[PDB]
């Protein structure tokens, strides 16, 4: 069912190989982990924040 | 709870082995585990020589 | 750049045989299946056969089984088709083409095609007859003179008027192969009708393949 | 052995327009349907190797998609270099098969033919046969026929046809059709006619002659 790919430096852009990574996100109603900063900033003291 | 197994714990020396130790104590939280399984039953594990 | 180049065409008497071949250039046939396909005049494309260059394994269309046999040689980096018991129905342009392994991919490299014909009347000049113009003009004030060209073989034939000087107003049709085993076509010249009695209208029917030609004069007649 | 059907038999599109040609395998061939572009006198060019696999060297204009079994081939902005007959090929199951081929027209002006009826000439009749000739000149759409009549009866099977190429500015072309009678049969009929019909003609044009005229 599978065929070898002739990926060569002599190929045009449509046949040059590309490395691909696909990011597929979780659909869980109760997520945790793989998180990030919520536009995190620095602490400021003696000012109204 | 909601797929999360929650663990709290405390470990102390004891004088009373017939019953559990007396006096107020609050257990330390350890972890919220995103597992996704149904727990209605359990067993323990021993090492065997 | 990879090319595939065909040769070996020509006429086969009905019931005879012909060997076709193609050479690969810029590409090593091994790893590919080499295929033969056919294009009869007036028809689309039919597959004939395929051979795996690196294995010798083959497949044939049901329509050619027992008649068309193929082979390949990677030392020569060429491929062959042996066509036996050829009939009039097998007149076609025969093509070489290739694809990966044994399938799941279409054919990438193609030759241009060489014509193989079959006919009981393999060498004929044309028979050319004039067509009288209508005596009454059509829209634009024009009228036309013509010729019917028939029973010649092989095709191509080049047809032009006034010995090739007249292209103006010239309408020509392609030749088709008739039941006679010979080819035929027709043409007219449409000009303002008074010009039909002024200009010369000779059908120049050229057959380089038969080493011949006919110069047929067409002119107005009572109509 | 999986045969495939293509449609339309011809498509009409101008330079810069879109072309849509489809092919339907009778059996699944996975996505292994290739497409070719053929001009008269040339080998078909490989455009596509499989439904979503385009060949380098093929204009970026060529693309397509599938719906169920059927594959649709399109050209997003047709150029003069793309007026060719398009064919499908399946490479899944042997024998390898091809579709029928779809022509592309340049989509110009529709016009009725100038109808020229040419009764058999005295010179042509020296052959021992008689060929009644009618030419439809400079007309469009591409599909047209002559309804040939002998003694005003519609006759079917004694006719012959050949068709010429379309004009690069008008899309028009001429149609050649004839009737073959032996000279002896020609002489036995009195009335001959060319009833011209086509897809754009609401009023058939009929030309006629009596036996022995012209």
From Swiss-Prot, chain A:
Effect of residue 15 to H: In strain: Omicron/BA.1, Omicron/BA.2, Omicron/BA.2.12.1, Omicron/BA.2.75, Omicron/BA.4, Omicron/BA.5, Omicron/BQ.1.1, Omicron/XBB.1.5, Omicron/EG.5.1
Effect of substituting residue 11 to Y: Increased binding affinity to human ACE2
Record region (Disordered): 29-49
Quaternary organization: Binds to host ACE2. RBD also interacts with the N-linked glycan on 'Asn-90' of ACE2. Cleavage of S generates a polybasic C-terminal sequence on S1 that binds to host Neuropilin-1 (NRP1) and Neuropilin-2 (NRP2) receptors. Interacts with host integrin alpha-5/beta-1 (ITGA5:ITGB1) and with ACE2 in complex with integrin alpha-5/beta-1 (ITGA5:ITGB1). May interact via cytoplasmic c-terminus with M protein. May interact (via N-terminus) with host bilirubin and biliverdin, thereby preventing antibody binding to the SARS-CoV-2 spike NTD via an allosteric mechanism.
Record function comment: Attaches the virion to the cell membrane by interacting with host receptor, initiating the infection. The major receptor is host ACE2. When S2/S2' has been cleaved, binding to the receptor triggers direct fusion at the cell membrane. When S2/S2' has not been cleaved, binding to the receptor results in internalization of the virus by endocytosis using host TFRC and GRM2 and leading to fusion of the virion membrane with the host endosomal membrane. Alternatively, may use NRP1/NRP2 and integrin as entry receptors.
Protein's name in the database: Spike protein S1
Source species of the chain: Severe acute respiratory syndrome coronavirus 2 (2019-nCoV)
Span of the entire protein shown here: 491 to 539 of 1273
